[PDB]
């Protein structure tokens, strides 16, 4: 528990530095250090960030972390790690997602 975040973490950054710094520095929209995956978990409702950036499913995203800035939201999904949250899915599971054993 509390490790899931650290996972996406290394994922996003690798993207920010690989996507040519698509963000000067994560706007830590939520509370602790970064959390673009949580509110993101909600965007799943739409799946299409740019589609959810201006929908009802966003009022929950944006509000989830307590940002009330739907625009900053997809800035989270799209601007900090679009390809990831969206294209990193792959619907994995047929090879054990969790690399660490229990």
Swiss-Prot record:
Residues 2-89 form the ARID domain. [SWI+] is the prion form of SWI1. [SWI+] is the result of a conformational change of the cellular SWI1 protein that becomes self-propagating and infectious. This conformational change generates a form of SWI1 that assembles into amyloid fibrils. [SWI+]-aggregates sequester soluble SWI1, resulting in reduced growth on carbon sources other than glucose, reminiscent of a partial loss of function of the SWI/SNF chromatin-remodeling complex. [SWI+] can be cured by GdnHCl and by deletion of the molecular chaperone HSP104, which is required for [SWI+] propagation. The prion domain (PrD) is a Gln/Asn (Q/N)-rich domain, which is unstructured in its native, soluble form, and which forms a parallel in-register beta-sheet in its amyloid form. The first 37 residues of this domain are sufficient for aggregation, propagation, and transmission of the [SWI+] prion. Involved in transcriptional activation. Component of the SWI/SNF complex, an ATP-dependent chromatin remodeling complex, which is required for the positive and negative regulation of gene expression of a large number of genes. It changes chromatin structure by altering DNA-histone contacts within a nucleosome, leading eventually to a change in nucleosome position, thus facilitating or repressing binding of gene-specific transcription factors. It comes from Saccharomyces cerevisiae (strain ATCC 204508 / S288c) (Baker's yeast). It is found in: Nucleus. Component of the SWI/SNF global transcription activator complex. The 1.14 MDa SWI/SNF complex is composed of 11 different subunits: one copy each of SWI1, SNF2/SWI2, SNF5, SNF12/SWP73, ARP7/SWP61, ARP9/SWP59; two copies each of SWI3, SNF6, SNF11, SWP82; and three copies of TAF14/SWP29. This is SWI/SNF chromatin-remodeling complex subunit SWI1. Belongs to the SWI1 family.
């Amino acid at each position: 528990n509390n490790k899931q975040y650290e996972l996406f973490m290394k994922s996003l950054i690798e993207n920010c530095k690989k996507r040519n710094m698509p963000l000067q520095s994560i706007p830590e929209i939520g509370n602790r250090k970064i959390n673009l995956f949580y509110l993101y978990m909600l965007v799943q409702k739409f799946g299409g960030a740019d589609q959810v950036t201006r929908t009802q499913q966003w009022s929950m995203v944006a509000q989830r972390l307590q940002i009330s800035d739907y625009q900053q939201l997809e800035s989270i999904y799209f601007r900090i790690l679009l390809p990831y949250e969206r294209h990193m899915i792959s619907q994995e599971g047929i090879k054990e997602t969790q690399a660490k054993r229990i």
